[PDB]
A = this chain, B = another copy of it.
Amino acid sequence: HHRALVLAQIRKWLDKLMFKEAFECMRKLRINLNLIYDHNPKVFLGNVETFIKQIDSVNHINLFFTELKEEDVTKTMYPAPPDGNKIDLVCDAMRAVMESINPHKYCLSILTSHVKKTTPELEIVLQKVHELQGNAPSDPDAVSAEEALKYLLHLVDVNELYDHSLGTYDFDLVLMVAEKSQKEYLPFLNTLKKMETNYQRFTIDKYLKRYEKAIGHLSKCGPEYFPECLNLIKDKNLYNEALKLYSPSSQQYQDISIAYGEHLMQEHMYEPAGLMFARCGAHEKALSAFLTCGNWKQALCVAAQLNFTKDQLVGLGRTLAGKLVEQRKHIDAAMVLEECAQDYEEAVLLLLEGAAWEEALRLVYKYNRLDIIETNVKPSILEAQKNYMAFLDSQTATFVVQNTENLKDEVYHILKVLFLFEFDEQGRELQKAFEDTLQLMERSNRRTQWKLSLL
């Protein structure tokens, strides 16, 4: 009972926005500092200004930062009868208030609110410690690039604080960190200095594994470096970000576009590669990329961009109809056959293979081939008939989620051609049949019509 009396107090203090009283006492009985947020997140955010202002101190408001955990201490350590990420909301919201009130007094704390994010923003923290090199000192009123290094050192690995210096490119800043911490690193700098401005920065970023940026340099230190650069891209997969670098219509932006074709190819994402080849004017490549997947619409555009003869098109049409057949895209294969090669007969058989009765039939009359009705169309209907019945045992008796309400359309369609051809018996059979096996599904769909009043 000795303890619960204190925590009571603290919960009432934080309730009356008295953060100092609460905090001063928490720190003296070593109670965890998260309480003062976790006790009520919606209130603490929305009163950050009056929080910051009550612990003016920078030791105190940094001691809060180090102690701040992702987890709610109200669930576990101090049991009690948001927007998103906690560490981030608090580091952000707190920093915006410190930014406003006095960026110069709170420098060391604003840096700490970058280092402590769920993904420490050390890139940003060092662009800030760099600016402290220029425009300093303005009296002991501000903080020097060295007073901040002493402090950051307690919070950031030394190998990681050094690796990030180099990121800024400012060498005096880079020395500052090695000397005010961990002289067999002087070889790197002393050869680095002897590189031209642009290629020096490339080597630094390729070394820090920052490839997207390291390309942003090699693109500037000359055209005899384009091959060394093209390599990086090829196998760091920097295709997207390298295109925005060189001007379009450049013979350099051209090679990067082809290599992106070739990489997309070798990755079995064939359609994107066909679109890239086709944009950068590589028609012969885009045609065999569009062929390998079943994109005939595009395939025929690229083919016109190459001026195929009426025959070379007939030949192409066939090749595609094959690729589409082996992708079970029968209706599509038929429509490339009747468009490109005027193969009336093959098209009609493929339409029937994909249960396109009405279109299978339009073609028959468009060509005086009424003989096929007997040979192929009526037999193909009657056989589908059976495969549709046999499927309503197979899927009725033998039955989680049954979307057999999407052959709702397909039955509608075959019912009409059944009636047109005097097959009433099997018509009424399927009508009745599909009806029951469709309502006989109510336990614990849509209103779209497929019936034929004619049966």
Known contacts A279-B422, A365-B304, A365-B305; decide if A298 and B454 are in contact (CB<8 Å): no
**A300 in the interface (beta carbon within 8 A):** yes
Could you tell me the distance between the alpha carbons of A272 and B359 in the complex, rounded to whole angstroms?
18
- What 1/0 mask marks residues of chain A from 355 to 369 whose CB sits below 8 Å from any chain B CB? 000110110111000
Residue of B nearest to A276 (CB): B454
Q: Is the CB of B453 within 8 A of A272?
A: yes
Q: Is the CB of A362 within 8 A of B275?
A: no
Q: Is the CB of B365 within 8 A of A279?
A: no
Shortest distance between the CB of A282 and any CB in chain B (Å): 13
**A16 in the interface (beta carbon within 8 A):** no
Known contacts A297-B358, A358-B298; decide if A452 and B366 are in contact (CB<8 Å): no
Q: Is the CB of A366 within 8 A of B304?
A: yes
**A14 in the interface (beta carbon within 8 A):** no
**A384 in the interface (beta carbon within 8 A):** no
Q: Is the CB of B297 within 8 A of A362?
A: yes
Return chain B residues, CB-CB under 8 Å to A305.
Answer: 365
Interface of A: prevailing SS: helix
Q: Is the CB of B279 within 8 A of A419?
A: yes
Contact residues on A (Cβ < 8 Å of other chain), bracket: 20 to 34
Shortest distance between the CB of A355 and any CB in chain B (Å): 14
Could you tell me the distance between the alpha carbons of A361 and B305 in the complex, rounded to whole angstroms?
12
Q: Which of A158-185 contact B (CB under 8 A)?
A: none
Q: Which of A403-431 contact B (CB under 8 A)?
A: 416, 419-420, 422
Q: Which of A276-306 contact B (CB under 8 A)?
A: 276, 278-279, 295, 297-298, 300-301, 304-305
**A6 in the interface (beta carbon within 8 A):** no
Shortest distance between the CB of A389 and any CB in chain B (Å): 22
**A269 in the interface (beta carbon within 8 A):** yes
- Name the one of B276, B300, B362, B420 contacting A278, with C-beta atoms under 8 angstroms: B420
**A240 in the interface (beta carbon within 8 A):** yes
Residue of B nearest to A260 (CB): B454
Could you tell me the distance between the alpha carbons of A419 and B454 in the complex, rounded to whole angstroms?
50
Could you tell me the distance between the alpha carbons of A420 and B422 in the complex, rounded to whole angstroms?
50
Could you tell me the distance between the alpha carbons of A222 and B369 in the complex, rounded to whole angstroms?
42
Return chain B residues, CB-CB under 8 Å to A240.
Answer: 454
Return chain B residues, CB-CB under 8 Å to A276.
Answer: 454
Known contacts A358-B297, A419-B279; decide if A454 and B304 are in contact (CB<8 Å): no
Known contacts A275-B416, A279-B422, A454-B240; decide if A297 and B365 are in contact (CB<8 Å): no
What 6 pairs across the A-B complex have the smallest Cβ distances? A304-B365, A297-B358, A301-B365, A297-B362, A300-B362, A272-B454
